[PDB]
């Protein structure tokens, strides 16, 4: 072959924290079909938004929006339990089909995105240069979003563990932990990675009795 | 400058499932220092092994081993709660210092790796060609390790939720769930991504009452 139809830019979705998560890497030959399974960020979340992105930046807001759609009818569950399969399918014609399926309900929604959508040539080239100009800023954002999500995990898992602990947790421990949880909830609102790590650390330092209780319960 | 000291290959650690997780990307100018926070895979895990890797492959076994060391004295806790900070620090001399610190205990261990360690020039070039020859095989492995870890999450979270559910969970539901959990535990032993997804799906399909109970408890 003298030509190869390839994707000029990565294609993916926005995940928690406003980061692009790639489903089809830049320079993939089409036709192609990839899937990954995602979950909910909150207890009892009833719907997710699938926001389809084109580009090479880590920040979702810095990539091109191809469209978005909602999947609802997610059944009441703890965060992280539902399995929402997202598939990106680019056919022989260069049409992208994105679907999200809830593996519990079997409910599914799709967006179809015409071959002509997204960034034109000049934007594509600016994009490839921008990811490269900003590799460091993007790395730092990726590490911040990671820390923030780990903090959110710790926040929510700890609160759950205090509730299952009940009386097993001493008064002093529970005061220390809940002060720390408030401070971490606040730091999760900022963009200061060290501050989040500082509150996580404080929570790790005050929660040792709680962790023992939680481990012993199961 | 007419020269720039840069890393010829990525440096990282082996994480759960035998995948390399990069701490310092290929082509990073030194001196440099990056950190990320990791956790434990098991309830009550008392130690982790930090296995330092050089190379561009997704499979840890396909990269060059720079050394390994253990961090223990991790206090009894549920999987995913401990915060083990791993830092890669390459100084002006090209020496890599790797340390792991438990943020709860403050316990820390390090390995120091001389500038001369790891792959020589010819292996470096073979490595860069191999990651490229095997981009697809590596992608598939990465997606398998991801699915496997999500399945492991589901397995362990579900078992915890059955225990906290107790009598709240109907007899029929609990039979269906525990059959599914056994089947998923078995599939997690294989390398068949679809089979794991099939058992996860079955668990999602039988657990809807359990998820309602779990959400209501918190």
């Amino acid at each position: 072959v003298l030509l190869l139809d390839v994707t000029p830019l990565s294609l993916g979705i926005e995940t928690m924290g406003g980061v692009m998560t790639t489903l089809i890497a830049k320079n993939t030959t089409i036709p192609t079909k990839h899937s990954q399974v995602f979950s909910t960020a909150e207890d009892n979340q009833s719907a997710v938004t699938i926001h389809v992105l084109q580009g090479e930046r880590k920040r979702a807001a810095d990539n091109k929006s191809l469209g978005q759609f909602n999947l609802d009818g997610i059944n009441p569950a703890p965060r992280g339990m539902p399995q929402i399969e997202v598939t990106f399918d680019i056919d022989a014609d260069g049409i992208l089909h994105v679907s999200a399926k809830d593996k519990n309900s079997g409910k599914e929604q799709k967006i179809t995105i015409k071959a002509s959508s997204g960034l034109n040539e000049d934007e594509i080239q600016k994009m490839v240069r921008d990811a490269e100009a900003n590799a460091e800023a993007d790395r730092k954002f990726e590490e911040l979003v990671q820390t923030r999500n780990q903090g959110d995990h710790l926040l929510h898992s700890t609160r759950k563990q205090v509730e299952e602990a009940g009386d097993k947790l001493p008064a002093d421990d529970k005061t220390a932990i809940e002060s720390a949880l408030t401070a971490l909830e606040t730091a999760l609102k900022g963009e200061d990675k060290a501050a989040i790590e500082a509150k996580m650390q404080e929570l790790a330092q005050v929660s040792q009795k709680l962790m023992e209780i939680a481990q012993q319960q199961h | 400058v007419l020269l720039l000291d840069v890393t010829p290959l990525s440096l990282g650690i082996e994480t759960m499932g035998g995948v390399m997780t990069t701490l310092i990307a290929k082509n990073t100018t030194i001196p440099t220092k990056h950190s990320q926070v990791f956790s434990t895979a098991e309830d009550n895990q008392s130690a982790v092994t930090i296995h330092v890797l050089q190379g561009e492959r997704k499979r840890a076994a396909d990269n060059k081993s720079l050394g390994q060391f253990n961090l223990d004295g991790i206090n009894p806790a549920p999987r995913g709660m401990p915060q083990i900070e791993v830092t890669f620090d390459i100084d002006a001399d090209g020496i890599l210092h790797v340390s792991a610190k438990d943020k709860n205990s403050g316990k820390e261990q390090k390995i120091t790796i001389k500038a001369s360690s790891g792959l020589n020039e010819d292996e470096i070039q073979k490595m860069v060609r191999d990651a490229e020859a095997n981009a697809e095989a590596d992608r598939k492995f990465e997606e398998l390790v991801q699915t496997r870890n999500q399945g492991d999450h589901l397995l362990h979270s579900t078992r915890k939720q059955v225990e906290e559910a107790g009598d709240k969970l109907p007899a029929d539901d609990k039979t269906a769930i525990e059959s599914a959990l056994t089947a998923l535990e078995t599939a997690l032993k294989g390398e068949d991504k679809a089979a794991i997804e099939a058992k996860m799906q079955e668990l999602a399909q039988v657990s809807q009452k359990l998820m309602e109970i779990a959400q209501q408890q918190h």
Partner: peptide, 8 residues
């Protein structure tokens, strides 16, 4: 719309 999905 609603929250974006989380990677597990």
């Amino acid at each position: 719309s609603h929250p974006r999905p989380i990677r597990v």
